Amino acid sequence: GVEAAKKEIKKLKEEVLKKYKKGEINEEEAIKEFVEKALKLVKAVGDEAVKKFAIEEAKALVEEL
Amino acid sequence: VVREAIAYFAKEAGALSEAELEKVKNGSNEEAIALGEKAVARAKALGKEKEAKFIKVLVEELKKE
Numbered sequence: 001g002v003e004a005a006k007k008e009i010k011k012l013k014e015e016v017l018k019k020y021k022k023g024e025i026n027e028e029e030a031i032k033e034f035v036e037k038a039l040k041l042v043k044a045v046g047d048e049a050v051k052k053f054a055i056e057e058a059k060a061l062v063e064e065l
Numbered sequence: 066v067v068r069e070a071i072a073y074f075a076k077e078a079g080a081l082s083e084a085e086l087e088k089v090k091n092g093s094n095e096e097a098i099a100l101g102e103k104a105v106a107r108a109k110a111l112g113k114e115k116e117a118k119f120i121k122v123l124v125e126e127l128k129k130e
Contacts, residue, residue, distance in 0.1 A: 027118065028122070039066070042066045055069065058070060058119065059073075059077070062115045
């Protein structure tokens with residue numbers, strides 16, 4: 001559901017950031033990996049709550065890079 | 066969600082105009098791609114390099130569709 005999808009989107013952002021701060025991926029690779037997997041998640045659970053949350057987590061991800 | 070994500074990041078970056086954000090959201094695929102490429106160029110010109118990168122990836126996604 002909405003809440004489980006949001007949990008997965010946040011956990012994905014944290015996984016991507018951890019790879020990036022470990023040096024395993026660069027900035028653009030981090031953006032790409034988040035965009036690809038979160039788009040999977042949003043299309044599977046397309047509620048407005050999920051779309052909004054994913055855009056917000058993308059904004060937090062980009063700020064932290 | 067891709068269109069809305071591009072419109073939101075171009076808004077936050079100030080890379081597009083209100084009319085252009087609306088045409089990103091509710092225009093044709095080709096004009097959405099065109100305006101996103103413009104927003105990429107405009108955001109990089111304004112020093113929003115991370116947002117330019119994010120928006121470039123989303124436009125690649127619009128093409129892939």
